[PDB]
């Protein structure tokens, strides 16, 4: 469980969101992992709940892009990125910072997505 | 304790590091706050320990800059930035992502600085 590996996992995650690859996303998580997004809302725990959450997230085609280098140290990674989508002619860009914590096996045991209304950038 | 306030606190923090303003930094924290930087190392707790930690951080003049919008939601903020300094003719730029959690009073109760060796950018 190295910085190289954690950075790679972040890149796999971004790419799988772009591809709508739900298996690929869920495969990154430990069986008892938790996901909390946005920070503040009630977390989802376990493979089944995690899959359901990302299924709802992938209803629309997402364009996802890392916007800076990944920060990876010890057993944690943080990264800045954008998620862009379009609905009823409005394009929206959401710019979160995510935090992953990894277990010794290199699977994500916790994901937290930090973004507020000021990080949601959309026209009329 | 609003996103506006948390964003302002982040901006006050960045500016106080630039100014070497140790009082200004410590004033942002709750009396029993913790600081952990880099993530992984042993955290420091309490006003006295927090001041000592930032005193050591301010031995050299720091140039600190937010490099993206702050992410602020509920009681937490995350931000991407750089800390630049020079020593013995070598310029170094460190690019962390910090996470703050706030108490109801609007003081920082926990700070975590996430950066690894790949986020330390220095010449020979
Ligand atoms: C962008 C988004 C809010 C956050 C978000 C979405 C999808 C995948 C995400 C993946 C993340 O790691 C962090 C945040 C999101 C939603 C899809 C529609 C929407 O409003
Ligand atoms: C940049 C640095 C490592 C991280 C760091 C420093 C100083 C203030 C910081 C403030 C932060 O919120 C996060 C990280 C740092 C150090 C000064 C010298 C050095 O190597």
UniProtKB/Swiss-Prot annotation, chains A, B:
UniProt xrefs under InterPro entries: Ketosteroid_isomerase, NTF2-like_dom_sf, SnoaL-like, Steroid_delta5-4_isomerase
Catalytic residue positions: 13, 37
Catalytic activity: a 3-oxo-Delta(5)-steroid = a 3-oxo-Delta(4)-steroid
Enzyme class: isomerase
Enzyme Commission number(s) of this protein: 5.3.3.1
Induction of synthesis: By steroids.
GO biological process per UniProt: steroid metabolic process
Residues reported to bind substrate: 98
Gene Ontology molecular-function annotations: steroid Delta-isomerase activity
Record annotation: effect of changing residue 38 to A: Perturbs active site geometry and lowers activity
Keywords: Isomerase, Lipid metabolism, Steroid metabolism
Descriptive protein name: Steroid Delta-isomerase
Species assigned in the record: Comamonas testosteroni (Pseudomonas testosteroni)
């Amino acid at each position: 469980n190295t910085p190289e590996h954690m950075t790679a996992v972040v890149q796999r995650y971004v790419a799988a969101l772009n591809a709508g690859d739900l298996d690929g996303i869920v495969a990154l998580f430990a069986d008892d992992a938790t996901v909390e997004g946005p920070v503040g809302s009630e977390p989802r725990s376990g493979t089944a709940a995690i899959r359901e959450a990302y299924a709802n997230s992938l209803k629309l085609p997402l364009a996802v892009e890392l916007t800076q280098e990944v920060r990876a140290v010890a057993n944690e990674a943080a990264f800045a990125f954008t998620v862009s989508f379009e609905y009823q002619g409005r394009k929206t860009v959401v710019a979160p910072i995510d935090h992953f914590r990894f277990n010794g096996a290199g699977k994500v045991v916790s994901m937290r997505a930090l973004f507020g209304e000021k990080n949601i950038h959309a026209g009329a």
